[PDB]
Amino acid sequence: QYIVARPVYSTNAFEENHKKTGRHHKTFLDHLKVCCSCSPQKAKRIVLSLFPIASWLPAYRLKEWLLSDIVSGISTGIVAVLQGLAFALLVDIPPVYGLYASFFPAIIYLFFGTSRHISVGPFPILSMMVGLAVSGAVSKAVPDSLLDDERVRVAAAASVTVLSGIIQLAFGILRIGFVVIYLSESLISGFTTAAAVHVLVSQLKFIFQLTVPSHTDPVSIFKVLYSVFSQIEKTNIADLVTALIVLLVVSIVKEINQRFKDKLPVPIPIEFIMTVIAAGVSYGCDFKNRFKVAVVGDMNPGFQPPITPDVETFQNTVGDCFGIAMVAFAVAFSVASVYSLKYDYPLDGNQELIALGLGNIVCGVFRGFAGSTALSRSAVQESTGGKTQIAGLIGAIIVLIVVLAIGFLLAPLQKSVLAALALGNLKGMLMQFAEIGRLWRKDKYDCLIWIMTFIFTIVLGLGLGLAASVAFQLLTIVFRTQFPKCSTLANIGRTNIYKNKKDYYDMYEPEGVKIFRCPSPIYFANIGFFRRKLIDAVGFSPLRILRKRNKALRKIRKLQKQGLLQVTPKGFICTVDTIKDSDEELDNNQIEVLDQPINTTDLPFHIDWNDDLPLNIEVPKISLHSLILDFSAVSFLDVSSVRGLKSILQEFIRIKVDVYIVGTDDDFIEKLNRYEFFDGEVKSSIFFLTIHDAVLHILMKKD
Amino acid sequence: QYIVARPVYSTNAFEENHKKTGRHHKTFLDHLKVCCSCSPQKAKRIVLSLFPIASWLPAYRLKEWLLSDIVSGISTGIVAVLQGLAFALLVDIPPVYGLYASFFPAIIYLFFGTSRHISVGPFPILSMMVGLAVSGAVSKAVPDSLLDDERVRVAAAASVTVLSGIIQLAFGILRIGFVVIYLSESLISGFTTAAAVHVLVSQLKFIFQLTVPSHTDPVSIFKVLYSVFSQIEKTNIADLVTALIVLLVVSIVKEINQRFKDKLPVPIPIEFIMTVIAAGVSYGCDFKNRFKVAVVGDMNPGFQPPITPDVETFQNTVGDCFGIAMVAFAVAFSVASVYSLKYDYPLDGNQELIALGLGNIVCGVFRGFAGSTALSRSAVQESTGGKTQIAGLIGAIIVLIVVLAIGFLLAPLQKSVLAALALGNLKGMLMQFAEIGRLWRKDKYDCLIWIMTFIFTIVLGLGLGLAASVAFQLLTIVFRTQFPKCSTLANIGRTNIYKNKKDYYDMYEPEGVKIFRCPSPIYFANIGFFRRKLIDAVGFSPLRILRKRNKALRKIRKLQKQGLLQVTPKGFICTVDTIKDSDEELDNNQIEVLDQPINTTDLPFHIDWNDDLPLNIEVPKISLHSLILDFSAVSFLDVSSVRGLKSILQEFIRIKVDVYIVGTDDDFIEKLNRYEFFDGEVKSSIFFLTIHDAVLHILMKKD
């Protein structure tokens, strides 16, 4: 049974009775001293962190990993070259550079990445942001045949990717890799759904084989839809039907692969065996002159010389570069986190940012585009049996083999099989659409975040949609605690349990005592509402009572000066039957005098202010004689709430009702001590430990 | 003394023992029914709210107000015409329209405003924002002698003010007048400081009588500084010296007016006598040909015909219109709130928005600009003795008299005495600069908001700086609770008081029990940090323990299948001296099997998992056998934190350690019931009332 026999504490007698350890809080000098205190072990640890490869390469086990690693590397390399060919078209650049986006960063990641399962490269939505940023750049560059336009587009892509990599490297160096926590789960869901719809709309111009002008940021998806639906009559029926059949069978075989896992190890690489089928069917049968199907151009073999990034493209695409870098880092961290949790190894987000930045910089310098890990490719690599990043090495080797020697294949490719392959990974993100119902029935509040994120992204394009969604998500925090369900507490069962005042039957509030609870932190957006709710719950504005008391005191002093009232130690003689009620109206610049606290030290009679006054003065009465604030859920006050709380406490103290604050820990009172909260009026003895402690102290003091 | 004797409760037995009132929460149908249920009393109340004038005109007391009201009206009218002349110059439009901005809205406010002390009109910040919006509008309008430029500027000003009034009216209709609470006190202070610097820089082109191009939003103050400092040699020494002397005398007299209040009622109207002596000195002595001082042009008497607002200017300045409307409403509410608190009358924010919108619309339709209440003018009107809005009527009457009959005056005005008068009321706002020190020594977190607001406003111009600062402040809200000071609790004095684990000496944690406290709400930005801190405090990742236990069970089952181990009710025979340790490496797509909950029902021996296992299995031991989460400060969980909490609770329950949640009220458990938090695993019996209740229940269950 709950049995306690302790003295009543008030966090002041408690501090005296129980001494503290007196821990020294960390200053600013010692922090700098300890981070700047270089040591050989610290240097070795920081170097190993900056070069994670040396951490695990000597620890590689050469018996149970090589076969699985090489198989996964081959499979992920094939899927990576196919995905690069598909994704390079989203930027309206020649597909050759796609191989670079699937080759250069991954190699760099091998020597700087900390994860062990993801497969670095391009993923479709990042490619779409690259394309949007490029279309913005070329349309804004001041001017000083189509191959020239393609070359300037690829130059813009390289520049934008180099700047994105520079931004990622700068973020990683500054050790601000904790930014990824500002993106909620609901915002991520909404962004994934909107991105799914965006990629579905953007692949249409390849499924139908039409020509669309490169649209811009303000409203992109709807413009692409309009321009692609205005020219249905100019479609290619053969390309449409082949895209539909390959997409349908790819989805079917993906469903079979997901359904059958135990009986089917090393899942069927339908992508390779089907791109080869499409290539073989196109070859010989000539789906380039018998039909008018667009075909991937002749691949020019060999690498390309690096080009310095353009300063003008840096200047014109800064905000979109910030956006693309943040999206890339967030996607990579979210993809790697699941595998890290599954296999239980440490993950360094900041090192991930550094590796991504270096990979992006290297790839962009060599005419590629921004890269990360792709969920579909990473899932393929892991499920095939990927163990370490050596699978990434084998994938890069396969991509290099394709880009160097085996390049005249994939040349008769249908240029729509790639689009269907890219869009076939849309099952998860589109099926995620069934999240409005769950959130609405669950929380009714994160559903608002999801819907607003979806609408904002769809309207604004992913460059600005993410930022607007983040702003709205941050605003929803203030929205949640904008109107706290402030309540009045009361005793239950004549014990030390206190609950809401409209929830039970055998309740008993102590006489002249009202207990208030505000179950949310009080900051700039809450102090007004908290003050209004507290005043309404109490039943009277303390300032009004104080002003009325001051006016009554002034009237009494005036009557005493006129001699109509004689001051006695007990009461007054009141040598008047009835006065004419010559109430005075105080002008401006003098009403503030009524705000001052009342001190009747001159008058021997201690006026009760609650029974009655001579000559029938107003003097409104108050039954409440003590107030306890249940600050058990208050988590932080900064400035405005502190000023409001100080004003409220001064107002209550001045009308001669004590106020007690209950439930706060030592950290809260320590923090409040800095705000100059305490002074000659609001002492430090108003803080207590538990509501029952406060009420017991009140009862002891009163009688 | 603190005496209590009650049974141990767990918010489930407590619910059964103490029945609830069963209050019916308001639905969506009843809310609509009650707001749509029109009633004659409700209609009368809503009409009186929509026309607050009829509320107080019959209640006017024509014995003690009329003299003070008329005096205040005359004084505020003189100061209002002077201020309008000064402020209209900030928009680079002829000063005539300034009178309109000081006349039209105020009259409208008389029939729609609810405040009783403020004086409606233009204030220099709103004029500057109008000027910036106009300069943006004319520079962006597609094209289809100097007076034509002035006429198009005034047309743009009228259009932008009409749109701002429309926005204000729309906001007031929608009853969203609570937006004004999103602006903290620190943000307000920073904005006022930056705006003081802005007005000081923008009055320079009049302080010296030069010519400056109308700069734009991106960086305005610095551009004006450069273009005004490149032409110091083209100044007017007479204008400079006269502006300096009028500034000096007005500052000195303001100082003596603040210092001397009791001995000097109805404060000296220094502005009126100063401008009249400046005009008299200019007249006759001809400060227009003896010197080259720019003067106010010949006033064209009479009103002007209304012009329809321009659609092109409407669409070109939507965002700046939103910004100016919000700034105007916030300024008016902040100015009126102080007086409402001083005189204790009801104040309606939504009605204030409606009145401001109607006034702005009427003024803009009649060729004026945006209007609000100015702190200087309102303070003058109140301190002179203003009692109600009739003083506003008298001020509007004086302005009308000036604009109709006495208009040839103020023509020999010096066009810099007005600038000096406008800038002389800046001391009380520039003295806010000494707020960085107070905040830094006080809170160290709102000082960041103040500095960021100052920098953002200075760099970006007010219209964008306000929005950027609001976004940063909303981000700071998350910043405060991004890294909660998570702590471990322990008993104090062998009683029901629990405190931090590094703050006392005679502490006693119960055996195998760790109590965790997270003193901040857990949302998307906190669940990862909370989980990491909790796991670190406990000392082991539960998932690792569960996986190792599952691996050990699989190995034991394999040995039993091979027959090397014989299962007995107590222990095993273990018919092997030592095995070769043929540890198996589980491949991918099968590791998740180790994640499944443990269930050794088939084996009769209940494995303790803490003493020892045959054949020297790893099986890490855990001393902790019960965990209590002090959810006394948790205020809200939405989705992501709920998912993380469910995962953590499942992980802990599966490794056979009970988990209890303590301190939450009925509202929190009711809310958590919706998130599908409870199921067959995490029952509803894990919630308790107090930490001592939880530990007492643990002790009772254990022994």
Ligand SMILES: CC(C)CCC[C@@H](C)[C@H]1CC[C@H]2[C@@H]3CC=C4C[C@@H](OC(=O)CCC(=O)O)CC[C@]4(C)[C@H]3CC[C@]12C
């Ligand atoms: C609060 C929620 C609803 C988000 C706010 C939505 C606005 C930011 C969107 C909605 C409608 C959009 C407009 C809809 C149509 C157009 C026309 C469009 O012009 C073209 O047709 C350009 C063609 C070309 O040059 O290729 C330029 C963007 C614009 C003004 C859009 C700008 C962005 C707007 C205002």
Ligand SMILES: CC(C)CCC[C@@H](C)[C@H]1CC[C@H]2[C@@H]3CC=C4C[C@@H](OC(=O)CCC(=O)O)CC[C@]4(C)[C@H]3CC[C@]12C
């Ligand atoms: C979230 C809120 C804003 C509700 C969404 C409303 C939509 C139904 C509206 C808002 C913006 C509108 C679009 C604004 C601009 C365009 C582009 C316009 O096409 C062009 O300008 C032609 C391009 C060219 O040929 O250069 C066709 C109409 C369309 C898709 C509009 C279709 C209807 C849209 C999507």
Ligand SMILES: CC(C)CCC[C@@H](C)[C@H]1CC[C@H]2[C@@H]3CC=C4C[C@@H](OC(=O)CCC(=O)O)CC[C@]4(C)[C@H]3CC[C@]12C
């Ligand atoms: C976390 C921080 C450190 C990352 C910021 C990214 C910088 C590495 C980028 C972003 C803005 C870039 C600048 C944007 C604009 C210019 C002006 C440009 O000057 C010109 O020659 C202008 C050309 C013209 O306008 O005619 C020189 C490069 C520079 C400094 C850029 C250099 C690279 C900068 C600093």
Ligand SMILES: CC(C)CCC[C@@H](C)[C@H]1CC[C@H]2[C@@H]3CC=C4C[C@@H](OC(=O)CCC(=O)O)CC[C@]4(C)[C@H]3CC[C@]12C
């Ligand atoms: C995330 C935190 C830790 C750092 C964020 C820093 C950025 C918000 C700032 C830092 C420097 C800024 C840049 C400084 C200089 C320039 C060049 C500027 O271009 C010009 O100088 C144009 C001049 C002309 O047109 O005459 C465009 C803005 C930009 C890219 C700025 C963009 C915003 C930047 C990257």
Ligand SMILES: CC(C)CCC[C@@H](C)[C@H]1CC[C@H]2[C@@H]3CC=C4C[C@@H](OC(=O)CCC(=O)O)CC[C@]4(C)[C@H]3CC[C@]12C
């Ligand atoms: C991160 C915090 C601390 C500061 C916020 C950074 C940006 C929001 C600001 C800082 C520097 C600003 C830039 C500074 C200089 C210019 C040049 C300016 O162009 C001119 O001055 C053209 C006129 C002329 O120079 O003749 C256009 C705005 C711009 C790009 C500014 C845009 C807004 C920027 C990037």
Ligand SMILES: CC(C)CCC[C@@H](C)[C@H]1CC[C@H]2[C@@H]3CC=C4C[C@@H](OC(=O)CCC(=O)O)CC[C@]4(C)[C@H]3CC[C@]12C
């Ligand atoms: C704390 C940081 C983030 C912001 C403050 C930095 C300032 C010291 C810099 C940043 C942008 C600069 C401005 C960028 C552009 C211009 C416009 C330029 O206007 C002109 O007349 C240029 C044309 C010419 O004179 O040839 C004058 C300098 C100025 C105000 C610069 C002055 C110095 C500024 C304000």
Ligand SMILES: CC(C)CCC[C@@H](C)[C@H]1CC[C@H]2[C@@H]3CC=C4C[C@@H](OC(=O)CCC(=O)O)CC[C@]4(C)[C@H]3CC[C@]12C
């Ligand atoms: C729900 C509440 C918050 C409503 C708030 C009001 C504003 C959002 C409305 C009121 C007036 C509206 C404007 C009134 C007139 C027009 C002209 C209209 O026509 C054009 O400018 C296009 C034709 C052309 O090119 O001339 C475009 C929308 C716009 C700017 C409107 C945009 C939306 C505004 C600002």
Ligand SMILES: CC(C)CCC[C@@H](C)[C@H]1CC[C@H]2[C@@H]3CC=C4C[C@@H](OC(=O)CCC(=O)O)CC[C@]4(C)[C@H]3CC[C@]12C
């Ligand atoms: C704050 C909440 C309560 C309401 C938010 C509404 C605004 C953010 C939206 C609603 C309607 C929008 C307007 C709808 C239409 C247009 C016309 C658009 O111009 C064009 O379509 C130009 C097309 C061309 O030039 O061909 C410019 C933006 C604007 C004013 C939009 C600006 C953003 C507005 C005011």
Ligand SMILES: Cc1c(CC(=O)O)c(=O)oc2c(C)c(OCc3cccc(Br)c3)ccc12
């Ligand atoms: C394009 C894409 C694909 C297509 C493919 O990989 O083939 C996918 O499968 O998953 C995605 C996921 C899960 C995404 O969310 C990650 C995220 C985390 C934090 C902030 C933000 Br913003 C985004 C974003 C894009 C994709």
Ligand SMILES: Cc1c(CC(=O)O)c(=O)oc2c(C)c(OCc3cccc(Br)c3)ccc12
């Ligand atoms: C122009 C101006 C003058 C000049 C004069 O009247 O002579 C003044 O004296 O005070 C001001 C104050 C105190 C201002 O802050 C009010 C505010 C409240 C809430 C949000 C925001 Br954003 C702003 C804004 C402008 C002025």
